[PDB]
Design an enzyme around this catalytic site. Structure first.
Site, mmCIF file in Angstrom:
data_model
loop_
_atom_site.group_PDB
_atom_site.id
_atom_site.type_symbol
_atom_site.label_atom_id
_atom_site.label_comp_id
_atom_site.label_asym_id
_atom_site.label_seq_id
_atom_site.Cartn_x
_atom_site.Cartn_y
_atom_site.Cartn_z
ATOM 1 N N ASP A 136 -29.786 34.934 -1.852
ATOM 2 C CA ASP A 136 -30.186 35.890 -2.687
ATOM 3 C C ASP A 136 -30.740 35.770 -4.127
ATOM 4 O OD1 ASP A 136 -31.194 38.267 -3.833
ATOM 5 O OD2 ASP A 136 -29.210 39.416 -3.614
ATOM 6 N N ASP A 141 -36.877 38.339 -5.701
ATOM 7 C CA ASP A 141 -35.667 38.968 -5.145
ATOM 8 C C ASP A 141 -35.774 38.312 -3.352
ATOM 9 O OD1 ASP A 141 -33.313 40.136 -4.404
ATOM 10 O OD2 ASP A 141 -34.092 42.186 -4.450
HETATM 11 N N1 AED Z 1 -32.051 43.793 -4.572
HETATM 12 C C1 AED Z 1 -31.965 44.645 -5.937
HETATM 13 C C2 AED Z 1 -32.278 43.464 -6.884
HETATM 14 C C3 AED Z 1 -32.201 44.116 -8.315
HETATM 15 C C4 AED Z 1 -32.629 45.407 -8.796
HETATM 16 C C5 AED Z 1 -32.401 45.822 -9.936
HETATM 17 C C6 AED Z 1 -31.823 45.060 -10.952
HETATM 18 O O1 AED Z 1 -31.614 45.451 -12.312
HETATM 19 C C7 AED Z 1 -31.366 43.827 -10.643
HETATM 20 C C8 AED Z 1 -30.821 42.930 -11.838
HETATM 21 C C9 AED Z 1 -29.090 42.957 -11.572
HETATM 22 C C10 AED Z 1 -28.484 41.972 -12.531
HETATM 23 C C11 AED Z 1 -28.782 40.572 -12.171
HETATM 24 C C12 AED Z 1 -30.433 40.340 -12.356
HETATM 25 C C13 AED Z 1 -31.192 41.222 -12.017
HETATM 26 C C14 AED Z 1 -31.492 43.068 -9.578
#
Ligand code: AED
EC number: 3.4.23.46
Length: 370
Positions: free
Chosen positions: A221, A37
């Site tokens: 991002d 990330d």
């Molecule tokens: N900065 C926060 C990053 C993040 C945190 C928890 C998550 O479940 C996700 C998912 C959202 C859907 C896209 C894939 C990844 C991303």
């Protein structure tokens, strides 16, 4: 310096569920799959038997674990994660052959964070200390890595749209791209903040005050799926794409309120326009442009979701953008490089492109100030 065969293909994932890398924490090493990330700065891992998790960090098993006696709470619009801070020894098996002591947030409670059916158990925040939680004194992983080893201060990402890719830590692999790299300044070291100076739909300019393309900010991002555009810009962008594709669609589809389906192998890519973002260059009055295809912004779920959406946090160049390009997070020189990815999805008519130089005036006016 130009070839890192160990690290090629070290990323895995599932469509819409992000890209993850294998990591080890503690002694003896506990293997965990960790979401990559670039839009956050905390190294955080499941530390309790949540039902969605294949595995989790068991601190009691690690002889090198040190408690920081400090909690951390990270809210989101949707849910959250919460945990206990500590440090431990960290490696990346398909990365550089080093081991570092890094901060780790042991996640003890979360909501709408872990994905049911996903194969990752944590998150690697690759952005800067400024946005670290609870504050900027909590040194992010990559800072720790650079500080403790001889690994050069840069990493690169090749995201290939189930899914796979490469995270090259400490350098660039020239086999991962074609043509030349073009660099845009990191505006400020918090998120990977950049400046968009011009937007074209099918070669046709939006003619908006460029300040609005960055209204709030524009960031790169890897943790976001979509290309996210500021409300006003999204409005104009959709209006242009909508008009460019008036060859064949419900109102809700453009707002991401429903999906659209075609018969297998009948997907009309050509009715959809290419989208170009011009980014500020390294030289005064000089810019370059990156061009993505409908292959990138129409994400399969043959049912696809329109992967461009509105935002109140500014532009987000998520996987939609990134999957078209090899992206170099050149931290040592405060810049991000873009080149055509050797692995991007395309047809026989159109491909992703990075082109320059173009002459663009008043590029500084495009940056939004607090
Ligand atoms: N900065 C926060 C990053 C993040 C945190 C928890 C998550 O479940 C996700 C998912 C959202 C859907 C896209 C894939 C990844 C991303």
């Amino acid at each position: 310096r130009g070839s890192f065969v160990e690290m090629v293909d070290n990323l895995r994932g599932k469509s819409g569920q992000g890209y993850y890398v294998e990591m080890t924490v503690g002694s003896p090493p506990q293997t965990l799959n960790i979401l990559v990330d670039t839009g956050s700065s905390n190294f955080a891992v499941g530390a309790a038997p949540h039902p969605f998790l294949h595995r989790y960090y068991q601190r009691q098993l690690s002889s090198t674990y040190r408690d920081l006696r400090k909690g951390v709470y990270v809210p989101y619009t949707q849910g959250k994660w919460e945990g206990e801070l500590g440090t431990d020894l960290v490696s990346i098996p398909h990365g550089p052959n080093v081991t570092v002591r890094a901060n780790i947030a042991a996640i003890t409670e979360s909501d709408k964070f872990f994905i049911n059916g996903s194969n990752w158990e944590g998150i690697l925040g690759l952005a800067y200390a400024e946005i670290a939680r609870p504050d900027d004194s909590l040194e992010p992983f990559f800072d720790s890595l650079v500080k403790q080893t001889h690994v050069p201060n840069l990493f690169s990402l090749q995201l290939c749209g189930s899914v796979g890719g490469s995270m090259i830590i400490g350098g660039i692999d020239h086999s991962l791209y074609t043509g030349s790299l073009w660099y845009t300044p990191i505006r400020r070291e918090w998120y990977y903040e950049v400046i968009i100076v011009r937007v074209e739909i099918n070669g046709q300019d939006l003619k908006m005050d460029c300040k609005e393309y960055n209204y709030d900010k524009s960031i790169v991002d890897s943790g976001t799926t979509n290309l996210r555009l500021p409300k006003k810009v999204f409005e104009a962008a959709v209006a242009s794409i909508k008009a460019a594709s008036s060859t064949e669609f419900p109102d809700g589809f453009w707002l991401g309120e429903q999906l659209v389906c075609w018969q297998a192998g009948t997907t009309p890519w050509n009715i959809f326009p290419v989208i170009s973002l011009y980014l500020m260059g390294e030289v005064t009055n000089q810019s370059f442009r990156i061009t993505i295809l409908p292959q990138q912004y129409l994400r399969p779920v043959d049912c696809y979701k329109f992967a461009i959406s509105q935002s109140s946090t500014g532009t987000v160049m998520g996987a939609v953008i990134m999957e078209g390009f090899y992206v170099v997070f050149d931290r040592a020189r405060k810049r991000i490089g873009f080149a055509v990815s050797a692995c991007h999805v395309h047809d026989e008519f159109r491909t992703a492109a990075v082109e320059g130089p173009f002459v663009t005036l008043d590029m500084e006016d495009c940056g939004y100030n607090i």
